[PDB]
Amino acid sequence: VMNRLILAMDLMNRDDALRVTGEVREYIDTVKIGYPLVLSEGMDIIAEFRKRFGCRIIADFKVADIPETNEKICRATFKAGADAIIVHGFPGADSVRACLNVAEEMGREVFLLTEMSHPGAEMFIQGAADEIARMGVDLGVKNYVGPSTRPERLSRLREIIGQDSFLISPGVGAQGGDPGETLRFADAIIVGRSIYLADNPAAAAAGIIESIKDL
Amino acid sequence: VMNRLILAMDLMNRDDALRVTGEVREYIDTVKIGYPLVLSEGMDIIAEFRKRFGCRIIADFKVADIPETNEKICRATFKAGADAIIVHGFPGADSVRACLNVAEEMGREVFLLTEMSHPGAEMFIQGAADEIARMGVDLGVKNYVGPSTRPERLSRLREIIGQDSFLISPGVGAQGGDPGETLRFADAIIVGRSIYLADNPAAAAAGIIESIKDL
Ligand SMILES: N#Cc1cc(=O)[nH]c(=O)n1[C@@H]1O[C@H](COP(=O)(O)O)[C@@H](O)[C@H]1O
Ligand SMILES: N#Cc1cc(=O)[nH]c(=O)n1[C@@H]1O[C@H](COP(=O)(O)O)[C@@H](O)[C@H]1O
Numbered sequence: 001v002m003n004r005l006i007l008a009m010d011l012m013n014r015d016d017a018l019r020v021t022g023e024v025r026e027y028i029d030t031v032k033i034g035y036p037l038v039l040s041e042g043m044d045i046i047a048e049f050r051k052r053f054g055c056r057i058i059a060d061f062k063v064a065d066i067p068e069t070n071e072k073i074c075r076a077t078f079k080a081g082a083d084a085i086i087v088h089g090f091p092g093a094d095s096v097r098a099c100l101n102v103a104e105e106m107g108r109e110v111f112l113l114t115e116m117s118h119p120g121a122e123m124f125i126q127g128a129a130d131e132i133a134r135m136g137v138d139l140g141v142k143n144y145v146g147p148s149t150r151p152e153r154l155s156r157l158r159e160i161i162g163q164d165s166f167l168i169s170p171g172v173g174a175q176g177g178d179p180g181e182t183l184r185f186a187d188a189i190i191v192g193r194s195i196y197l198a199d200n201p202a203a204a205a206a207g208i209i210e211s212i213k214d215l
Numbered sequence: 216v217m218n219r220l221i222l223a224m225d226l227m228n229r230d231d232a233l234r235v236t237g238e239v240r241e242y243i244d245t246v247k248i249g250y251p252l253v254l255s256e257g258m259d260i261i262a263e264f265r266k267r268f269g270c271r272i273i274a275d276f277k278v279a280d281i282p283e284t285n286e287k288i289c290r291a292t293f294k295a296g297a298d299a300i301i302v303h304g305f306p307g308a309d310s311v312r313a314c315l316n317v318a319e320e321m322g323r324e325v326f327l328l329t330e331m332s333h334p335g336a337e338m339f340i341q342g343a344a345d346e347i348a349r350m351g352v353d354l355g356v357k358n359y360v361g362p363s364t365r366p367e368r369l370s371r372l373r374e375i376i377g378q379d380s381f382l383i384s385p386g387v388g389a390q391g392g393d394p395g396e397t398l399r400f401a402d403a404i405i406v407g408r409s410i411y412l413a414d415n416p417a418a419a420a421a422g423i424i425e426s427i428k429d430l
Contacts, residue, residue, distance in 0.1 A: 010284065012287060012291065034280070034284060035276070035280075035284070035287070035288045035291070036284060036287035038254075039253075039258055039288060039291040039292065039295070040291050042257055042258075043254055043257070061250070062277075062279045062280055064279045064303055065249070065250075065277055066331065066332060066333040066390075067333060067335070068389075069225060069249060069250070069251060072225065072227060072250075072251035073250045073254060076227065076251065076254040076255050080254070088279055090305050090339045090340060091331060091333070091335050091336065091339075091340065092333070092334070092335020092336060092337065092338035092339060092340070093335055093338065094333060094334055094335040095333065095335045117281060118282060118306075118307070118309060118310065119309055120282070120306055120307020120308050120311075121306065122307070123307035123346075124304075124305050124306070124307060124343040124346070124347065125305060125306060128339040131338075131339070132339065135338070175281075193283075
């Protein structure tokens with residue numbers, strides 16, 4: 001991804017989301033669109049973004065249902081033009097496999113979310129995360145998400161998935177993660193509020209890239 | 216809920232979803248709408264159903280993000296007219312509390328999904344599920360979801376949440392669960408495909424209710 005930086009576009013207004021995305025487009029090559037924007041403006045926003053910005057779109061839908069429902073969610077999401085979808089690993093291998101089957105059918109990608117970045121992830125997810133990552137490897141998952149807020153965990157996740165797998169990492173900025181340290185282990189960082197709530201989102205993005213280029 | 220039966224409306228077409236829901240409306244009082252329908256037809260389908268059918272709507276969005284994103288998802292969902300939202304407990308107490316805070320602000324309800332009904336739930340969720348339920352009790356959650364496919368687990372979950380808590384249960388019919396056995400422990404059952412894929416959905420719903428009445 002361009003400059004190893006993915007914008008988490010979680011504004012909930014089409015005009016504000018378009019404005020900020022257009023302002024930082026020279027500094028990114030992929031935008032993560034989640035439910036805050038989609039549930040407020042509709043699934044058509046994915047193809048609008050893909051067209052107007054020529055960016056790749058990751059649908060951060062944290063898919064976490066039974067296999068039959070996961071298949072439907074993935075089909076709707078790729079039909080809407082998303083390049084990839086983020087899927088939770090904790091519902092188990094059959095739920096992940098359902099998403100992989102639809103991605104194979106539609107020529108798209110699945111990212112497996114292993115450990116999450118927020119404090120509550122320590123309660124249940126962290127204890128299962130190594131095993132979720134190993135499950136991913138066994139299923140042939142090549143794209144993973146793990147937490148900027150815990151670089152020791154990001155290191156362990158990288159160890160499990162190997163160097164060939166692609167690893168992206170949220171929790172940079174607002175949640176306390178650091179771009180440089182996270183990029184020791186992740187291929188790309190995801191950044192939302194530090195950019196989209198900034199007085200000058202382009203200046204915020206540029207500042208991040210300057211720190212990245214230095215690594 | 217009327218007749219202790221909630222329709223899981225996971226058809227992806229507005230016309231088919233409206234047809235089936237209309238045909239079975241005399242036998243239910245609540246419709247569970249999830250991402251298959253919403254991502255295909257838009258969030259406005261929630262208010263359409265509420266208006267047309269005068270039914271309560273549970274948004275089955277399996278909310279499973281960090282606290283800040285959860286609050287955004289819950290706000291959009293209640294703005295759209297949902298009566299309640301289903302939230303995963305696996306991501307931890309702060310993520311659940313974020314949803315409870317928005318439900319409190321907006322005068323709506325949260326259902327906490329503890330153990331899931333599909334085979335993959337055995338890998339990670341089942342081992343955490345008693346603790347997820349206890350966490351719900353500690354947070355003051357009053358509405359829970361647990362699996363028709365494992366009535367011994369449903370019994371244990373009922374034990375933890377007490378008799379005053381409201382418990383709904385999917386996995387009836389297509390996934391193998393039984394209405395009568397599940398209603399030993401749950402207050403209401405959720406049924407999707409056994410009704411919506413039936414040649415005569417009204418006849419399928421009526422058959423289920425006849426079996427419920429006998430208990
Ligand atoms: N993908 C993802 C995901 C997994 C995770 O463990 N932690 C996150 O913050 N996220 C998402 O990344 C973004 C982080 O944004 P921010 O930079 O904290 O504002 C949000 O969209 C959040 O929902
Ligand atoms: N709520 C919920 C949920 C939790 C769970 O553990 N198992 C489920 O099947 N569900 C949902 O209930 C419905 C079950 O539908 P069906 O009766 O198997 O066709 C689907 O919407 C599924 O996504």
